[PDB]
């Protein structure tokens, strides 16, 4: 719970890890990739391009 608004930083809302976070999903590259695979991420499939 940071003091000012600037200090507040995007953290992986599942991991808790504060890195690499995708604003659309609030996930780091890791937690996302894993869940993407399993297919729990409504319409996000792996691409070929």
């Amino acid at each position: 719970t940071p003091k000012f608004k600037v200090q507040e930083y995007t953290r992986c809302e599942r991991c808790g890890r504060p890195h690499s976070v995708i604003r659309k999903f609030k996930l780091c590259r890791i937690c996302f990739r894993e869940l993407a695979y399993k297919g729990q991420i409504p319409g996000v499939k792996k691409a070929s391009w």
Binding site: R29, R33, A36, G43, V44, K45, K46, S48
Partner: protein, 95 residues
């Protein structure tokens, strides 16, 4: 009446529009048949830097497929029949 449908699977989105059009045509109102609207392509590129500058790419993609359904000369039964129809979990029915 103007309906906009949005989905992640174009199959269920077509099966939706079929019913939306068929329910309006059994209701008797003239339909502008489902306009295909420019499908949105959000691509997510997770890079894992190797030797710093080379970087194994992995791309994911979300497609929002869109359909526009105008209903001309609308009817009481139409307005009802539209609310009666159950468009699936993967479609957004905007009126």
């Amino acid at each position: 009446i103007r309906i906009r449908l949005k989905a992640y699977d174009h199959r269920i989105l077509d099966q939706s529009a079929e019913k939306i059009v068929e329910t309006a045509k059994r209701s008797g109102a003239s339909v502008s048949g489902p306009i295909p609207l420019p499908t949105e392509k959000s691509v997510y590129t997770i890079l894992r830097a190797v030797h710093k500058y080379k970087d194994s790419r992995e791309q994911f993609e979300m497609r929002t497929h869109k359909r526009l359904i105008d209903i001309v000369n609308p009817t009481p039964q139409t307005v009802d029949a539209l609310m009666r129809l159950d468009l699936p979990s993967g479609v957004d029915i905007e009126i």
